[PDB]
Symmetry: C5
Subunit: 336 residues, 5 copies
């Protein structure tokens, strides 16, 4: 009762050429793609890439595989995958894609009487995600995933998402777990590209990432915030205490300087200014300006002590308000 | 007397198809899994994953392999592994699983007269272990290990642990050696998951990890503890010594600041506060507040020196008690 | 109607030897190469190399593959690639070249009735790009890409770019995206090299890279600029304030020192001076010289106070002008 | 005269099954192992592992390979290695073992008339070496190397070292070169282990490593030694010089603090105290205590100046002696 | 006219056994080796290894390959490489050697009528280069490259360099480009080694490397040089300025301390002192001694001010001369 299955498989491969796509010279082969994200791996900002584990699935029609038997489906494994024609799908932005072979090559092959074929494949893709860090860290990144045929133009093989966008891409609840990103949602798109070798259909899946703030708050913003507050303490010290107020300005300015370098060490070496950089510069100005106020006051503490005292007392109030006022504009500007 | 063995093996493979699971269309194939952990590799907190070396073993019944002979068992190696059907077991959370091929592919295959099959396989899994670092470092992590069929639904192939939980998972005494973790114990669990391709049985093994404290004590807590004590020394200095007390506050605050950044460098970039972070903040407040006390005292040392002296003398006692009182609440809160 | 295709392929391979190049002993095999850069990967300055993803394409004539049929072209995949002769092309400067095999080996094979063959191959090359960092960061780097035959001398196999330079190399608009480089343009070149085994033709593709400045401005130049300004503040302080002015000179000089080490940490360990290094040295001299002025003034503040005061007042003006004057010469010298 | 060799090899493989161990069902197969260490690779303390390059050799008896001919030996290469049965030897603690295939798979196969077989194989093992860093750096580590059969229990295959321990393991004079370790010697051991699948013989080779001190002396101890001496200089300064002595204590304490963190950065994240840590703590106490002495003296310099001066003068002598006395106990305690 | 080539190749393989070396049992096989270094890769000092890309070539005589035909040579590729016997050459010190397979395995095979064979192979070797850093950085390193047979003793296979040393090893002009090394020249050597398995011939190629100084000058020496000069400035300050001179000594000593740690971070963890370390120690003594002079002077500024002033004035001259005098001895000692 099992030998029946074996005979059918031999018949299907009898006179079957895997080098020829189904329906060659008769029509255009249609392929349906559905993606299930097993886990959305970490996003390496420095390398401008991300890791993803998916169960990539394809469906298409092959008349040569039509069969009649008691069983309407033929679940199988990688053993028969190489014996028949499969599309030469590849990822344009996939820099290094390697499948999993342990314990067994994770491949599923199913066939129905009508000749429909289902070929689900597991993959891990280190695809690149270019990002415009103009509003970093309050940025919404759109990491795409582009794949298509390598040798079959749009006139021979066509890729189309199955059903709607919701069913086309499925993300596991526990899979979408990142340390510094929120997976807001997913979208799909298709387009044609003309090249030297002809037109090729392209399937693009976009993942909307909303960076979660709070790590940099504990890392960069707070030290800058407290650093500015530390410098303003010098305004409460006597003018004649030249040495004491000198340390406050010198130490704070250097403290801000090292934070600027340290903060960008983890950040990618992008040749443009981010929102964080502007925030650092403002904090640098406050501490730097505070030092100037002391130096200017100390310079005129002899000729006109009266005005010098007014500046010191006035300074204690002006700077905290300006720093507080700036923050509301800053955070409100980006958090909206 | 050895040729007898060779003839039997040829007979078993005579007319045997490895593309068809045993008992197809007659019943549901039952698989028993037992795991022996050769060594529990290091846990990379930054990468939120861990390494494990195990002798994964599976057992199932195949009537096609029934044989009669003087020997009741047929120990073998990887040579015959690929010649017969094996389950397409894979690890859902296994990000990169690679077997060991040196000196020889570590695979064992045994067969009995009844047709029972034993297939033990060695593997090294870089599986991911998501962790909720709300109580870090005093946290108990539950790193799971999920595996199941990739192409055979729950209606065809079923995985079940053999005997009880104790015998199902075995850990070598010397294997469970980690630098910053205690292997409290192991547990097993099974569940069904419904997907587009059908229901699949899932086997989950949970390892209970109790992080061992003491590395961070020598790394983060003690420098913070001594740093707070260092700042309080300024309370024992004369008020007029403005420059001397100034250095204590400035240096200590920056010292705490750098520790906060340095401490999280090894810690993963998680977007939420840990218990250690709260401890750092409190230590920051003490040193920061100590500076305020000196600044406030130095500001009113002219108008009302009497009250200023009282604050200084009172400060020497209040702060150490508060810091000592806080620690008892802190450690007792988490160590319980 | 499909079997016709299968018969033709069998006929082509009937009596076809892939170990013999086409037109052997009759003429010289001519190969046309066209390159399409899918994406210009990051350039690792420390490793003096770069990553590139290209669709390398070759064209040549093979009389043995002449065929007659209804279809004038035979699109195919990697399956037939190994069945026929192909050139042993390799990259001389390619340190580690690995192709992409997922989902399928990205290879295209096309044949026409005349016998023309097109063999496009995807590759990722970690080629080395030697750079002369004499004008770093204002440098224009010319990263080449050299490839040629490994076993067929120039007398047997010849590589020539197809059409002009513009069509020979094509770069995708989104592919040429780097963090700290501008892809100004591309060029091609060919040359013969004589070795022990004979003459071999060489095909060289040069990419002109214009480093984009601005990352180092926020990283190195600005801290140096503000550091120099910070030191000059000591010139506005009273001479008798020995301790206060002492901190300015000491802290600034060390600040410059650490920047010099930190700046070169990311830079490759090149045994020669860059333009940035000279800029750092000048900034070091200003801060260092400022300390000398205070020390010299403090030494003669007793014997001849009159001249000491003149130097201090004069110093406040001389140094800022010299630093400002130097920058115009510096930036203008390289930005031209 | 060469064809004679070819005929014999064909005869040996005629009717030879590599899936059956020699002497099956007649006796227990005996295997002799001899190891020649080509080079003892570096030991990664952080990863708790080491690299080793060896020419692993095995010897056993196979009656099926008995032959008669003019030549008493048959030197060969990897070509015939896969054609005959070989043991499934594997390394229990080998985390990632990969052989060398360039230029050719480094395998030797020799056969004599009696049927004795010699199978030498080159390997590189990233085996793990657990270490008890209780006396670090003055520690003697015993890195083992365990290997045995994966599928053949102790009742079928037995591993035994050949001759004595000296001949069993051979280390090249230039191979045993490490940056921070001395290869004192080697030893061998055998034991039986009972598991679920049966008893398996185990062969263990232990390498005695005596860590060479001197790198940490220039890295950790000396900075601590000079740091303590630097703090004691404050004892030679006048009491009224509050600011000057303040810097000594503050800077030295922070200097010790950063050394503690920096020292353990290279050290593995072990959750227990090492000998170096205790040495650091003592040095921390001296600098910390020195600050207390100044603070205590400065506090009572008004009420009882006489006793304050005695403490300062006495302090200059007590602390250096205690630090010197402690070192003799420390180094002598571990260097014995 | 092409079929003639195909027939000859079939005849050569007709009755040809690749498991038997040529001239077996008749003479000793002689192999000539010539090396062409495509590029001398970077030398990783920390890992004590280097990367090299070479076109390794071998030549030997095989009577079985004698043929007669119109063409006197048979250029080929990797296709026929595995069909015939080749030596089992391996690199003793090669830790990880991997060939290049893209676009095609870079292998050339040529045969002449007499039976001479040429087999050029491309390789990339991460060989280890032990170094004695006694005179670092002014050191001349001799990185070797050892290779030989793995299974054929010296009595069967012999390796000999072809012609003289100049022709034996060839280095491309642009290939020998390193960041911190000069390729002074190359040499070859041969020797016999006796082991358990017999005598094996060894071929050794030595590369003479002259480290280029200048990177450490900008990294370590200059900061130390300026640091010493900075400390000596305190000698020009008034004795009563206790606080000011205190900062100079404290900051400079710590600055030297951090440089010592930072300098060795890139340097390998060698357990012995280098020339740079001695230079650092001397610079440490100057800054450390300068602090002692101030402390000693400040201690006796009351009892005998006259002698204290003499020391200060004398100190300003003695220390710069000693530091200048030391450098001439230092650099001249190693630069000769
Ligand atoms: C691509 O080409 C096909 C040709 O049938 C067309 O139907 C489709 O709309 C095109 N897609 C785009 C995005 O232009
Ligand atoms: C999974 O399905 C099987 C069907 O027989 C059932 O017996 C089992 O209880 C199910 N497991 C769970 C966890 O629901
Ligand atoms: C290389 O040799 C060929 C021989 O035909 C010649 O035509 C060509 O000009 C040569 N190229 C160069 C750069 O000399
Ligand atoms: C292991 O078992 C064998 C059985 O023959 C015995 O001879 C040997 O002594 C045992 N080894 C140990 C260490 O117990
Ligand atoms: C190695 O042995 C051969 C034996 O013929 C001898 O000719 C050669 O000189 C020996 N080489 C050395 C370095 O001793």
């Amino acid at each position: 009762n099992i030998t029946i299955f074996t005979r059918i498989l031999d018949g299907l491969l009898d006179g079957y050429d895997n080098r020829l796509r189904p329906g060659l010279g008769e029509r255009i082969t249609q392929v349906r793609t559905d993606m299930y994200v097993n886990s959305f791996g970490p996003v390496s900002d420095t390398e401008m890439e991300y890791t993803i584990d998916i169960f990539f699935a394809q469906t298409w029609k092959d008349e040569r595989l039509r069969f009649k038997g008691p069983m309407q489906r033929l679940p199988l494994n990688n053993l028969l995958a190489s014996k028949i024609w499969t599309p030469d799908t590849f990822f344009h932005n996939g820099k290094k894609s390697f499948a999993h072979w342990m314990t067994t090559p994770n491949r599923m092959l199913r066939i129905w009487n009508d000749g429909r074929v289902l070929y689900t494949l597991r993959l891990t893709i280190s695809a690149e995600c270019p990002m415009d860090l103009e509003d970093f860290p309050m940025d919404e990144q759109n990491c795409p995933l582009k794949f298509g045929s390598y040798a079959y133009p749009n006139s021979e093989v066509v890729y189309v998402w199955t059903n709607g966008s919701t069913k086309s891409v499925v993300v596991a609840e526990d899979g979408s777990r990142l340390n510094q990103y929120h997976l807001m949602g997913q979208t799909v798109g298709t387009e044609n590209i003309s090249t030297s070798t002809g037109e090729y259909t392209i399937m693009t899946a976009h993942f909307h990432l909303k960076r979660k703030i709070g790590y940099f708050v504990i890392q960069t913003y707070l030290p800058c915030i407290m650093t500015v507050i530390l410098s303003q303490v010098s305004f409460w010290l006597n003018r004649e205490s030249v040495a004491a107020r000198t340390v406050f300005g010198v130490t704070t300015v250097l403290t801000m300087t090292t934070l600027s370098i340290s903060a960008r060490n983890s950040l990618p070496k992008v040749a443009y200014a981010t929102a964080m950089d502007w925030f650092i510069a403002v904090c640098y100005a406050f501490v730097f300006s505070a030092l100037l106020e002391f130096a200017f006051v100390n310079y005129i503490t002899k000729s006109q002590p009266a005005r010098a005292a007014k500046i010191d007392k006035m300074s204690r109030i002006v700077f905290p308000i300006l720093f507080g006022t700036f923050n509301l504009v800053y955070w409100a500007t980006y958090l909206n």
